[PDB]
Specification:
Rossmann fold, 20 helices, globular
């Protein structure tokens, strides 16, 4: 053979591959190179025209190399939105009707997500990212693994990212928490399901680092989002800072912004120092041709600012920005955007050991070679990598210092949970009886959970030291009620309402898999064990003085091996969230700490509960 | 092209590869497949005949595929012992004379090592393993990286192992600590040197799991070593147990074994219970056709037993076993050996997710594809993997419980160190002044270090609470002196005598690299930062009641980025040792705890020192 395709001819002959997100990017190249390797490929994506173009290019290339009947080797599945369970079912039916059993599931489709800080991230947007990027991967595995096991072989490859972290270390990805969590979950799925899916099925993840074009000059869109986010953060922080030492309401302070005139605000002797200094910064550091140097904000930034203030408990009319003067384009000049873009690019290039951006083709080639390896499962392959970014090793204690524990005297504690009644009882009693907290607000899910805690804590309920709130599916409003009625918290300890499910994770070879964890149950797992913590953190990260502990699920000697796997899946995946929001919290004027406490280790009862109390105290006791 | 070599033709055309351990195993297959891929290969090994056979097989295969002048494509370097620095220099000269600059350094050679528990592992045997398996890798990199950087490209691949651990988690490998440490160091070298060697040079490791034949039915040799080790451990533990409640000297107890008669010992009413029960176990659980069921030991086991007793401070004549009756072959029958071998095999197969052993050819093929990837550095690729073995996440606190701290009253503390005078001063003062230890024995390297500590601790020296011993290069004898003169220790805190070197780790492109960390300096680094701790642990693991803390090097704001890299290299590599000896310590009757305390994190001064004190106390305070 002659030509670079030689390395490929026969490499994957006889295999059927399904590739989601197959019309462009790494997915299109994986589908191209698998087809050149002899596999029959189904390319799934939303846009019909781009899929048709990709299909025609691959078929033409196959013909050049000597394949016949190339129409039988490359099929497409257009209009496939992987965030829709119904459309994933249709994709599997279409693929099995075209080719029969699937050998390779290439879970490649991915959306960028909300691309906002957690405190600006709508809850439904976070959910959408999880459905598109993570739950879709489980869904397709659940539909195709039964046939793979029955035929005796199969392969599931999840296309994760360097920014999903590593097996025992988390990486923050600011303004991308939904994306990072989804990437971490794709990796965690391979790590924890491999022992169940073997020996018939291999499951691995790839985690490329930065790849050419993955931020779509190539960084101008990212640069503009960065500059818009900077303006939002600086305005919010100056308003919060001003409000600390000014008697006016937040409503009246925001009215100072309504002229939308940087020069006017700087010279307004009635404006608080922090807002006059901010305006001086916008002018001093701005581009005279950018309207951001003469105008404070625009409609989009104002909407996000208003939402932060509302979510932090400030009262303002919804129409407060309705008459805001619109700054003339450009809000940021091309000079400013290109400057920030060069900053982004130079930052990434400086982090790469090899000082060179891999291409989509390069990454796909390495991946298609890797797919030939029949002796690996449960691994995360890095087809590009070598980065100087700092990681946070996970899952490595004692009690905090006596001086920090004394700062809990008179504190207000929020505990969130329902299932873990023994933990909630003991933690409430430790804060109240050992460390002199003024009160504990117990936020549960249901009336039955409330009555259970009131019975366990009867003495403190009667004494007015334990209050109970029933949150249902409205945890944000429940936190609002607690703030209004009982005051802002110091310690906030967030445990999951729900236990882990007790269902099998794989089926017997000749079983219909009807009892195996369903696609809807996996979505519920994400809702109860990830989104629960995200919704609490999103609110508490606007609550000055809070120290938030996110607690992952318990495993006991009664727990099944499936529950141990799901606990480990959740621990890994939530660590991506915890690491990311920790960095984002450095940008608000509100001072908050966010830490994760894992109940499942790596495997009398009162000592295991006591170590939990100590771990929680270590991250919720403040410092003088 | 037709035939499985198609995937390879041209893949590595124009590359020159040096492969150590190239005459058999994975190394021979890597050399074969690189040659088929178009590379010119130099195969280095000890035995000339096996190398000549491998060379002839590869050249014949090249001719089949259509290469001409195959004698120019595959050279050999026989008689190459990679544990000899002089022979590595000769290998590089031979390779550059044959082919010019090397593109790929495949650091594949590896020896199994001592294959004994640490307490039975001669210090020179441990050193030999480090020279063959780890220091050799740095040495060849130091000789070939200058030419690689000058030409603008190169690749260094270290052939590590799953049993060298993972980036942020350690794996114990009992009876193989020297091997595991060497494998961890090969991985750590790639992790920490990649940022220095980029952008010109890629450096990665591979870490295969179990591979067919790697224990050389295939497990019978391992099985026999296991059974011999079991007999040694059970005899030693019964003697130590007997000595706790028997007034006779260890000399007199060992005399009870000299008839070498299991039945006689079981029925000897003058023998301690533990020894009569042991003999009953040997008979009851033995094979009547094995002489191990009727004889207590053989000359080899007796020699290792005598060395353990001598190393634990017991006085016995060197010739005590000189007249020991030799048990007739077989000592263990084929039935027993095959039984244990099936146990070993079934254990490994049960740990593999895919329930299938990869072959040498499979692993080599995956590796040769991986070598084509130009976008990865600093990674550990797993060409086989998916194992259920339990790992220990590293590098994740407070103070230990008041009840454990009270157990330090009246204790005897050993501190070992020299460079870290502030740590040693503060730790000694914490044990003596805060926790009421009876005495601290300060074991230093030199008279100057001794005088420095005596000056810092003058008050405690004058009061008779601080004793100093100068160990030089005789740390084992220094510990013996401390035990004899001051009593057995509780806490033992082992810090390195020496600081990390302050030299560059790479040279400028056109430099002669004359100031870069030399091959001898890297060997010294291993001696001072790894072997130091091994020698102390080897002795202290025979000292009942000790709690040993192994402390890795400090980095301060004054430390260079090179020192930060070397600290991280040492932390990773020593964690393999700490994890392994921790498991081995479960087999002795002596009760010892071994933990590792890392001074370098991931980056006023008195608070960093206070956190060190708390960390050390957390692992040296006993439990009621």
């Amino acid at each position: 053979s002659v030509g670079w395709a030689e390395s490929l001819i026969g490499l994957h002959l006889g295999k059927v591959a399904l590739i989601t997100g197959g019309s462009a990017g790494i997915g299109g190249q994986i589908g191209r190179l698998l087809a050149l390797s002899g596999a029959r490929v189904m390319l799934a994506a939303r846009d019909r025209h781009k899929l048709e173009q990709m299909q025609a290019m691959i078929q033409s290339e196959l013909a050049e190399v000597g394949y016949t009947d190339v129409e039988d080797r490359v099929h497409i599945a257009p209009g496939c939105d992987v965030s829709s369970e119904a459309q994933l079912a249709d994709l599997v039916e279409r693929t099995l009707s075209a080719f029969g059993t699937v050998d390779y599931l290439i879970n490649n489709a991915g959306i960028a997500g909300v691309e906002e800080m957690v405190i600006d991230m709508p809850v439904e947007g976070w959910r959408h990212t999880l459905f598109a990027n993570l739950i879709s991967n489980y869904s397709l595995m659940r539909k195709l693994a039964p046939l793979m096991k029955k035929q005796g072989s199969g392969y599931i490859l999840n296309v994760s990212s360097y920014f999903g972290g590593e097996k025992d270390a988390a990486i923050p990805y600011p303004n991308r928490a939904d994306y990072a969590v989804s990437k971490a979950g794709q990796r965690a799925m391979a790590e924890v399901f491999a022992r169940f899916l073997g020996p018939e099925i291999q499951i691995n993840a790839i985690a490329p680092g930065p790849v050419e074009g993955d931020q779509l000059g190539l960084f101008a869109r990212r640069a503009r989002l960065i500059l818009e986010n900077k303006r939002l953060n600086e305005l919010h922080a100056a308003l919060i800072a001003a409000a600390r030492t000014d008697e006016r309401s937040m409503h009246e302070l925001v009215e100072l912004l309504l002229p939308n005139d940087v020069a006017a605000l700087e010279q307004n002797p009635a404006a608080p120092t922090a807002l006059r200094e901010l305006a001086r910064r916008f002018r001093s550091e701005g581009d005279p041709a950018a309207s951001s140097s003469s105008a404070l904000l625009n409609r989009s930034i104002a909407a996000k600012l208003l939402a932060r203030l509302h979510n932090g408990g400030y009262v303002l009319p919804a129409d407060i920005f309705a008459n805001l003067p619109n700054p003339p384009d450009p809000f940021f000049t091309r000079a400013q955007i290109d400057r920030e873009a060069r900053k982004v690019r130079d930052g990434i290039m400086g982090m790469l050991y090899l000082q060179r951006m891999p291409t989509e083709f390069d990454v796909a080639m390495a991946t298609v070679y890797y797919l030939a390896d029949r002796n690996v499962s449960g691994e995360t392959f890095h087809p590009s990598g070598g980065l100087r970014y700092e990681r946070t090793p996970t899952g490595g204690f004692g009690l905090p210092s006596p001086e920090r524990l004394a700062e809990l005297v008179g504190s207000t504690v929020y505990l969130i949970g329902e299932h873990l009644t023994e933990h909630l009882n003991l933690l409430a009693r430790a804060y109240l009886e050992r460390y002199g907290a003024r009160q504990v607000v117990m936020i549960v899910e249901t009336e039955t959970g409330a009555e259970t805690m009131r019975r366990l804590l009867h003495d403190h309920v009667e004494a007015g030291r334990l209050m109970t709130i029933v949150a249902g599916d409205q945890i944000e409003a429940a936190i609002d009620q607690a703030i209004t009625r009982y005051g802002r918290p110091g310690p906030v300890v967030c445990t999951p309402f729900r236990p882990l499910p007790t269902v099998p994770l794989v089926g017997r070879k000749d079983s219909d898999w009807s009892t195996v964890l369903s696609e809807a149950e996996f979505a519920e797992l994400c809702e109860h064990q990830l989104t629960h913590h995200f919704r609490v953190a999103r609110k508490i990260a606007l609550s000055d003085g809070a120290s938030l502990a996110l607690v992952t699920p318990e495993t006991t000697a009664t727990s099944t091996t499936e529950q141990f796997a799901l606990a480990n899946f959740i621990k890994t995946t939530l660590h991506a969230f915890t690491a990311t929001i920790g960095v984002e919290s450095e940008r608000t004027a509100q001072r908050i700490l966010i830490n994760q406490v894992d109940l499942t280790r790596r495997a009398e009862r009162q000592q295991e509960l006591e170590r939990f109390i100590e771990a929680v105290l270590l991250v919720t006791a403040p410092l003088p």
